[PDB]
Amino acid sequence: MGASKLRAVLEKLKLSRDDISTAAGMVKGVVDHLLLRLKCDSAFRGVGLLNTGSYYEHVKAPNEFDVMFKLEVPRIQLEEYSNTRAYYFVKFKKENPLSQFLEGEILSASKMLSKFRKIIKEEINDDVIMKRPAVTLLISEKISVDITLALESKSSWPASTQEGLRIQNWLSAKVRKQLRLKPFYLVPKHAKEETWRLSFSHIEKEILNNHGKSKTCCENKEEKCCRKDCLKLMKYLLEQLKERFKDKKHLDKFSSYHVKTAFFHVCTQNPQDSQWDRKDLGLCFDNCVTYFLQCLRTEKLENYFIPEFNLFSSNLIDKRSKEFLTKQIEYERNNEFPVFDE
Ligand SMILES: O=c1ccn([C@H](O)[C@H](O)[C@H]2CCOP(=O)(O)O[C@H]3[C@@H](O)[C@H](n4ccc(=O)[nH]c4=O)O[C@@H]3COP(=O)(O)O2)c(=O)[nH]1
Ligand SMILES: [Zn+2]
């Protein structure tokens, strides 16, 4: 695939620019209102908007939004669950604003989520309609907004992330150090329970928006790379393939985060900006796909922050599904990607 062809596909996808402001206005208004009203509670006093992009996490999809509400929870004691390395029980090390959500010694996620959804449903009452881990809203019978509650911890990152975030040869060890000083998050998610999974969406956004070895990367004509284009192309490939086979539960468990993680690993493999030259968009992309296929074939896709947490384990995704996706992707690459046609 020629780089200009790929960029033609991407530019063809960018045709939603005029609508972006119109949607962002309404969504921004509703979300801000929900924040204003939601701040009134004692438990959700320090609630806030994490704002990690505020754009779409799905390309092809201008109607679906994803927002995340952070809550400062000072002095927390995490307890690892069954060596899952990613899922934890939240404890407290007396006066606790979240004491009402305590089911014994462990902070209950279901009750807190219930109070959350209850307040939000109390505020939508006064053309927004709530739908039956996340809380989905429907603005103007068109726009979908996924709201996620996340606990914020300004403590040092858990031990399972010690050997994660290998960006030393890419973005330098200095940046890794300053990044690991930032807080980490916890989203309500069960393991394959009342457990919480680690989340570093802010870090992902940060490394994506500051992706070059050079500080001036993508700031001048001579230093424009094709990292973001590769990520977008991968995401679009997976999205189109999932769209073609929506009638099957094979590709249901495959999503953009797998693609993003694989992309991050590829970035680690190719730390130099010269390895992501603009004119080489065709090759770089071809690399990414290949690596992704490897992750499908070897059934190994380590979380970029939690190396011992495998996203492509047999327990999470069965071999058959990965083989099917492999077949489809390989066909696509072998036939100049006909799935990008429209
Ligand atoms: O921060 C992250 C995000 C994703 N992952 C892994 O993929 C996780 O295994 C993901 C891999 C797919 O994730 P997703 O973003 O594509 O899609 C999510 C997400 O859309 C929704 N969800 C989950 C939590 C939440 O608080 N609010 C939500 O709406 O259920 C989907 C499936 O999530 P899983 O646990 O079923 O498996 C991580 O490890 N850390
Ligand atoms: Zn760049």
Side-chain angles (χ1 to χ4, degrees), residues 1-14 16 20-44 46-56 58-59 61-92 96-124 128-131 133-140 143-176 178-191 194-220 223-245 247 250-341:
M1 285 292 297
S4 296
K5 287 191 60 181
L6 299 173
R7 294 191 201 92
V9 175
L10 294 173
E11 192 186 33
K12 186 190 63 185
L13 293 183
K14 287 193 303 178
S16 296
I20 290 175
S21 302
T22 304
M26 310 176 184
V27 169
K28 180 184 180 298
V30 173
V31 166
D32 287 337
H33 213 260
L34 291 178
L35 238 58
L36 290 177
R37 180 67 165 86
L38 203 138
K39 269 187 176 64
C40 291
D41 194 273
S42 309
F44 305 97
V47 72
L49 180 65
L50 187 49
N51 202 76
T52 54
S54 64
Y55 187 67
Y56 304 101
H58 193 132
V59 183
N63 299 329
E64 314 161 356
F65 276 95
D66 291 85
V67 304
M68 189 173 302
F69 293 171
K70 68 172 193 174
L71 178 64
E72 299 181 20
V73 189
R75 201 65 189 96
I76 47 94
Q77 225 294 331
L78 302 180
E79 184 179 49
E80 189 178 11
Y81 164 73
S82 300
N83 301 327
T84 51
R85 300 286 185 268
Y87 302 89
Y88 296 86
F89 292 104
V90 175
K91 296 182 180 182
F92 298 89
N96 196 334
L98 309 180
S99 57
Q100 58 171 320
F101 303 140
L102 288 176
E103 250 177 358
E105 196 173 41
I106 278 77
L107 174 65
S108 176
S110 59
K111 291 184 176 179
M112 186 168 175
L113 229 57
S114 296
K115 187 70 176 298
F116 187 68
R117 195 183 191 96
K118 187 180 68 179
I119 293 178
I120 298 188
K121 80 177 184 180
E122 277 183 12
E123 183 45 40
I124 58 99
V128 186
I129 297 172
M130 176 184 289
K131 303 179 184 179
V135 175
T136 309
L137 300 184
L138 187 61
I139 305 174
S140 299
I143 308 175
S144 299
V145 179
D146 288 339
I147 307 183
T148 296
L149 175 63
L151 310 179
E152 171 182 289
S153 178
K154 289 188 173 67
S155 303
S156 58
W157 295 7
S160 62
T161 69
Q162 190 62 55
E163 301 303 322
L165 197 55
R166 291 194 58 180
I167 64 179
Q168 301 90 348
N169 298 334
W170 175 21
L171 302 177
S172 78
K174 190 182 290 85
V175 170
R176 189 183 179 273
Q178 71 160 302
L179 282 181
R180 287 186 59 90
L181 290 180
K182 298 182 178 301
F184 64 96
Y185 296 87
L186 295 157
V187 294
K189 192 63 186 180
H190 297 340
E194 296 294 338
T195 54
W196 303 76
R197 188 188 65 205
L198 296 172
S199 186
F200 308 90
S201 301
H202 59 308
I203 308 299
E204 299 163 357
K205 173 192 179 182
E206 195 162 357
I207 63 180
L208 272 181
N209 294 334
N210 209 7
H211 53 253
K213 175 180 291 300
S214 174
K215 296 171 180 176
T216 61
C217 186
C218 287
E219 276 192 14
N220 57 81
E223 294 185 71
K224 277 178 175 59
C225 74
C226 66
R227 290 186 176 92
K228 285 192 177 174
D229 283 342
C230 280
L231 180 52
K232 292 173 188 170
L233 281 175
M234 290 289 300
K235 289 185 63 181
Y236 187 55
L237 174 59
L238 181 60
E239 281 167 17
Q240 289 294 99
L241 285 182
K242 282 167 61 69
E243 180 181 346
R244 189 194 292 175
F245 305 101
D247 291 85
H250 288 91
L251 309 177
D252 289 15
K253 296 182 179 179
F254 298 108
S255 67
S256 59
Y257 187 84
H258 298 136
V259 153
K260 184 189 294 183
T261 303
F263 171 72
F264 284 148
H265 287 297
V266 172
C267 287
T268 299
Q269 293 174 27
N270 300 264
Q272 304 296 333
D273 293 332
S274 66
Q275 302 181 271
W276 296 93
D277 193 278
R278 192 189 170 91
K279 76 181 187 303
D280 294 326
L281 174 62
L283 287 177
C284 300
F285 178 59
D286 182 35
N287 293 339
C288 291
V289 173
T290 290
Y291 178 71
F292 191 71
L293 287 175
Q294 190 181 240
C295 295
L296 288 173
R297 186 175 63 256
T298 59
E299 296 186 272
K300 293 185 181 66
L301 181 52
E302 304 180 351
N303 184 285
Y304 197 66
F305 304 88
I306 316 160
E308 286 189 359
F309 175 44
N310 184 17
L311 305 183
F312 278 178
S313 69
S314 58
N315 305 328
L316 297 185
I317 307 176
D318 55 332
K319 181 77 175 177
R320 184 191 303 177
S321 298
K322 282 169 285 192
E323 289 178 339
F324 184 84
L325 183 56
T326 290
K327 176 181 178 59
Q328 302 309 314
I329 295 181
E330 281 183 339
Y331 176 87
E332 291 297 327
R333 176 174 65 178
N334 276 323
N335 296 275
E336 294 312 307
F337 296 96
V339 83
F340 285 168
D341 298 343

